Amino acid sequence: LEDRRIPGTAEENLQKSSGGVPGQNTGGQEARPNYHCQLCFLRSLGIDYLDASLRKKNKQRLKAIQQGRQPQYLL
Numbered sequence: 001l002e003d004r005r006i007p008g009t010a011e012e013n014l015q016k017s018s019g020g021v022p023g024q025n026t027g028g029q030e031a032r033p034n035y036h037c038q039l040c041f042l043r044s045l046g047i048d049y050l051d052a053s054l055r056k057k058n059k060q061r062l063k064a065i066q067q068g069r070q071p072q073y074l075l
Contacts, residue, residue: 003041004048004074011074012046048072 004011012031022028026035027044035044039054050058052071059066 003045003050006042006045009045011048016044016046047074 007016009016016027016031017023018028023035024030025033027033027046031044031046032038036042038049039051041049041051047070050071052059052068055071058071059068
């Protein structure tokens with residue numbers, strides 16, 4: 001059990017939730033807002049988020065990952 005396919009989304013193969021209930025906060029159109037406050041991640045995640053804001057302990061280790069614009073993305 002890891003990120004990317006935690007809510008049966010499979011790297012957002014189509015979308016997390018929209019028909020019947022989207023929830024902009026959980027990730028409706030913007031996708032990245034308070035779902036898990038773009039840090040908590042695990043519950044939503046429009047990619048392999050990791051967390052490119054708090055990151056726990058990643059953006060700083062590699063001399064490139066500290067920047068990388070976003071984090072692990074859908075790669």
